[PDB]
Symmetry: C3
Subunit: 594 residues, 3 copies
């Protein structure tokens, strides 16, 4: 059979007849070439016509069926890694079939089958104006009946290019990788670019999943039209999962108004070490009761740390909501080490600039620590705040940040009336001066709430801003109790108003407050120790006060310290070297229970 | 020789006769197929019987000898990476021989030979009830005489499964990867699961080693029995080494009582960016003089940062100890950005809940910075503390954390009597309210020590807790000197006790203290400026005090501020508009040297 | 043609005649062995003589031309990854030609051609005493006319060894990887060792580039001679780029004086999670107007976070400078979570020890947040400071750090006279005690500036140091305005000087200041309420003061609180139970406008 031998060698079984032993090692396995080649697999092993002849990829070739066949086949052997080869662009031009069809899926991923994308995957214009999810991990059109996707990793130096196609309708959805009910899945190194999509990657489904991660990926120009309803680049919807060391960039005007880089929706999730530019928002951090089926109705242990961002709206948005039968709770959050700015834009030209936003009764948000962050907004941006507190809050703690923007705490008057509890603004927060002189008519801490309880505001200025109406103001509609409100005197000598309580709330039994004020006093005419009394009777709530002014006089001195009287006068004991009625104006620190 | 040609091609030298040139490039090397296949190596190249026929792996096959032969052979050529193939489970069923036998080793690692684990490595029931170290980098049963393991990396998407086997005796030890005297070794991406082990990975030996790292690994259910004496998932025992972006999970009740995620035992080590659930402890940070031979007797530059944890005992434990000839020192530690909770459990049902624990004379621990962390414990967990300070401390500094648990500083009375120096609790630490109303009979800062020197405690409440006995208490057995202790007045108006010095320690020459108190005063009957004096004589130590109460009276006012007299009365000058002896009760801020 | 068949099989086209189908799958592509082998490429495919025979690498073989041919060829097919094989050392012994020749380049990198370095690349002694850049991404000797290098990644477990060769002249330059105008390029996992170089890696060119990263690399002993002018291991000169999780080590005495680990020179750059030992400096953070052509004249969003360092000079150095036509600005910087020490060395034996250094009119540096860091210097190191403020500063904010060194704020007298604005030193900075008793003749905050405005210094001691001349001192040459300067009383009772204003600057209209002082007072002889007046007349600027001393007297008490008089006396109302002139010395807290 020498003719048969040559034909076998030239046949597809040929490599299975050529023997091999590793490095001529007589202790190694006696193999055939085919066995060694079978240790790897690429798209080339499936990218063939029905007669087995390889097809070159290109804009006129739908690679979908070939990629699916490769995934299917490797799955059947218990898994492996399929290379998508460098130096080629592989186009996708049709929808997939079966369980992914309900999900507008293109490729169905399978457990233990990894994709090493080194070349480029592009969408063909078949998808213009249509929905799609490029890779889908569900195995059923009903996700509630889907099996899991496990141990599926997408990685490499390659690219997923969405073709630039706009959305056809705002009700459509588009995704890159919908991992599904995903356990130990990841995407690493991939660039996702040029699209109009809802998400690039979604991890999990309604809390179902674990240990899913997006690392060292790039996301570039993924919103490009006015049709696109909403965008969150990575959507984390399973626990013990997160995003780290990624890069996010947008250039579209639309992105400034609708795009968020990350949403965290389940417990023990994180967003670290990433850089964002051109987005509306940094991260949504939420527990929606609608997605509580997999991991519970609490989102807790949520970390947003060490990120760099230029955004046009709000850095971190906190929220929760409820269903008719399920209640969401958000607690145990840390936001730390982030360096964030509002990009150059006109005032009011994008959603309100904020480092933290509490968005819209329902909210159950508490135990949030905001520490060691920097925030800046250019001086023209009136709509910029350390916190826009627009809905109920049950706790948030700010320590050792540096906030350089128009407001510290803001809510718009006559909009929402939030109930606030456990808002803590430590004195170690540094208030920048970029907006000094821009604050005519404005309150630095504008406390436009229904009520404030168990809260601390310790205002410390670091430069003058005499333009502002006040440092902190409480409208008469805001109840205030069991709270501590202080204004440090530095840089406040020339301010007409420091703290303003429009309903005289500072008189509350459990309100602890100190702020500077100018007070007119008159003494009796007695030589020697002599009392000085305030002309006004607005000080019934004052427990003590003390001088912030020098005494220009030789012949007498006002009291250093004052207490009050039943009629609301302040009273203190000064000294008349020579007698006579004295009249002075003095800057005092007014104190109540502090 | 045409018969010889066909036989050669079918022989194991066949591939060495089929020529190849890369992509038909006439400028490329004229090679044989075998040369290209020899650029890679897998377990298949060694997993053969004595006649060279490949053996399929499975539960009835001991893969150990084959894996060892592959490692040995690649080592002999100066290194490489051996793939452990996907889609198969490779069982290990015997101990190795030679230098690793003293270490109960299964596989001996070798320098420059990396393992790319894509499939699964499982332990066979041969190992039930026995000790083992699955991969061992020592080359000698005496580690002091061992050569080094250098440049050995274990990585991939695969799994090491310990088979679920319990320990046979609590004196046994079990490990996944014992790298040995390890320099530039790492484990990346691997899942370690289903066991009862002492460690999953140990880096270094008695300080010997460098540049060893565990990254993006998972560790799941590695304690499962009551026999297991102790567990630390990763044990870092060489410098310039650490753990980052890993996931640790336990489900066993035993793990809650004995398992720690990481121990750091040498200088310039770190534990970052990781998530822990179900463990007793987060990290031990220590310098044991017994392990000082490789890198010295100082552990310094130790970082525990940006981790997420649910634990049942103590997050970070600090310690050192000594040998008859060597003294260990621990200094220069940072703990920051961590978000930690005590999981749901009954009070006292696990080791005492703590964010920092100083464990058991000997201790030389100092220069520790604890900053920007969040800690929570459910309201029922009586045994929860920001710090359990149970042994001598020479310094620890707490700045800008948020601690929401039962105690801030605790030590059990009549147990240890620690000597405390340089404990600094900055005012920027926020004290949560979850345990409000639960503190009957308890002191928030319970200073159960032999002595306290050069320490600062600045207590700032953020809500009321009238259940507590005091904010801070010093028993008479605790010496207090050269210290600053302050209680801010906010939320304290209704407290009977704020700071308690049971030995009147606040009278010390170099004690700086301020806290609120209620004081009864009586005046002389003089009209005009008139003195008011305290009825009690307990105020000889007071340097000044000032009013925290309003004055309900028209006809007189008490002094705003007071000093003292030799007999221990307070005294101040008030004002009698009309004469008469006055008697009042007032809330004062008592101050000593502040 | 059976003779022809055997000859074809033995020829370099042989593999192109042996058929293959993946795993015998009749649905797979009918391929040839050569097609599968062509899916990978290594240096072996090009490392051949002119007759196609492979050449073994070694010290007598210049591998350069072969590596270049491989890169060239893969480039021609649109990219790929070339393996540099493990188990071999590949020597480079000549310069490259063409566009890289102007750059003293050895290898020209090309777009989309990645290098997987598993073996070792060594420099041959041809390069002793000469300049070189081992890998160069420019395609033109004039970088301004160069095309870009895109999508070029160098990775693996291998090594680049510079051969130990010293520089021949201090004007020479040497680099490992000069990526050029580099977009999406990276180096991961590589060890760079044994050299005398200017840099190991430079990312970008004059701001041109994006998305370039150095991750998990090691840099060991890269300065070794007195000839070497300057060294920065990684130089980041394109935006959206950075360094993470690397290790840097030097052992040379020269490195202590000239080597920096990282320079960041463009916006949105970072240096995270790394460990440094033996270097002079940690990171330079700068915007040099000379490099503003690619990315603008602002460096903003600059992060230095979570690093471990032992250095001999300055951790972070901030700067900017200008050109005749372009002005550089540095703003929006965060330095956080770092644990840094000055290594063991004699005082003044290396560049001045500092955590932050502001280096040398020109500087426009502002919005810098320094938070949550630890810094230590041994007690002998006189030249150690939290900040050496040696040039103009427009803002820097310090919150919640722990600084344990000789000075907090320093500048040498009669050197530079910096103009300082917006320097904020929050009270939450903890000042360590290691240098207690070492500060004879020294001011802890030594304010040797031309002027200080809009600045806050809140000094809080945590132990005594009676050796120091003062806590803070302003020479009369330093203007001080619109500033807040406070010294907390704790541990200061025994200090002769607390805050010193040598030009009486504390009297400024907008200066807010409080510090302790000892004051002698005398009373009138009146029984009853009686005034006490200071003997000295140095207190015209004081707004209030209060007692920090107890009253040892029964028969009288001095005032608790004081104001002042026009003549500069303090005055207060005390109480004479029995008449008589009183004379006392008291410790007061002096306050101005606070
Ligand atoms: Na209301
Ligand atoms: Na004692
Ligand atoms: Na001057």
């Amino acid at each position: 059979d020498p003719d048969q031998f040559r034909a076998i060698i030239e046949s597809p079984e040929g490599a299975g007849h050529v023997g091999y032993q590793y490095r001529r090692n007589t202790g190694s396995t006696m193999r055939m070439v085919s066995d060694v080649l079978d240790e790897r697999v690429s798209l080339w092993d499936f990218h063939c016509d029905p007669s087995g002849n390889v097809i070159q990829p290109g804009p006129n070739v739908d690679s979908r069926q070939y990629l699916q066949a490769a995934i299917d086949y490797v799955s059947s052997n218990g898994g492996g890694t399929i290379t998508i080869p460098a130096g080629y662009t592989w186009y996708l031009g049709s929808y997939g079939v079966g369980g992914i069809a309900g999900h507008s899926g293109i490729i169905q991923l399978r457990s233990n089958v990894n994709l090493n994308i080194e070349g480029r995957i592009h969408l063909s214009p078949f998808f213009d104006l249509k929905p799609f999810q490029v890779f889908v991990g569900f195995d059923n059109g009903d996700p509630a009946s889907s099996g899991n996707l496990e141990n599926c990793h997408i990685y490499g130096h390659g690219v997923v290019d969405f073709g630039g196609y706009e959305f056809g309708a705002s009700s459509q959805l588009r995704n890159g990788v919908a991992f599904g009910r995903s356990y130990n899945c990841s995407v690493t190194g991939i660039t996702f670019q040029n699209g109009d999509v809802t998400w690039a990657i979604t991890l999990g489904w309604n809390g179902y999943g674990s240990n899913c991660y997006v690392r060292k990926c790039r996301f570039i120009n993924l919103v490009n039209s006015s049709v696109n309803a909403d965008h969150s680049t990575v959507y984390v919807n399973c626990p013990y999962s997160g995003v780290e060391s990624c890069y996010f960039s947008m250039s579209s005007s639309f992105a400034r108004n609708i795009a968020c880089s990350v949403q965290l929706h389940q417990h023990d999730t994180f967003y670290r070490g990433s850089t964002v530019n051109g987005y509306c928002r940094g991260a949504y951090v939420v527990m929606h009761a609608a997605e509580a089926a997999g991991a519970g109705s609490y989102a807790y242990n949520m970390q947003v740390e060490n990120n760099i961002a230029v955004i046009y709206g709000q850095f971190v948005i906190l929220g929760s909501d409820v269903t008719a039968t399920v209640s969401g709770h958000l607690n145990d959050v840390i936001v730390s080490g982030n360096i964030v700015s509002i990009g150059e834009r006109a005032a009011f030209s994008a959603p309100f600039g904020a480092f933290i936003d509490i968005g819209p009764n329902v909210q159950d948000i508490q135990r949030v620590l905001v520490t060691g962050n920097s925030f800046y907004a250019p001086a023209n941006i009136t709509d910029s705040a350390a916190i826009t507190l627009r809905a109920n809050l049950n706790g948030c703690t700010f320590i050792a940040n540096n906030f350089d923007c128009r407001y510290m705490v803001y809510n718009a008057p006559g909009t929402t009336s939030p109930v606030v509890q456990n808002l803590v603004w430590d004195k170690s927060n540094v208030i920048g001066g970029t907006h000094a002189n821009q604050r005519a008519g404005q309150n630095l801490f504008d406390m436009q709430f229904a009520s404030v309880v168990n809260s601390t505001i310790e205002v410390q200025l670091s430069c003058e801003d005499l333009s502002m109406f006040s440092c902190i103001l409480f409208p008469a509609s805001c109840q205030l109790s069991y709270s501590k409100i202080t204004v440090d005197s530095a840089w406040t000598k020339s301010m007409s108003n420091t703290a303003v309580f429009e309903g005289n709330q500072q008189a509350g039994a459990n309100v602890y407050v100190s702020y500077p004020a100018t007070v007119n006093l008159t003494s009796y005419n007695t030589q020697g120790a002599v009392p000085f009394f305030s002309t006004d009777t607005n000080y019934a709530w004052v427990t003590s006060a003390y001088s912030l002014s020098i005494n220009e006089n030789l012949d007498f001195s006002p009291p250093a310290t004052y207490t009050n009287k039943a009629n609301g006068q302040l009273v203190g004991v000064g000294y008349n070297e020579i007698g006579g009625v004295r009249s002075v104006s003095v800057r005092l620190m007014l104190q109540r229970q502090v």
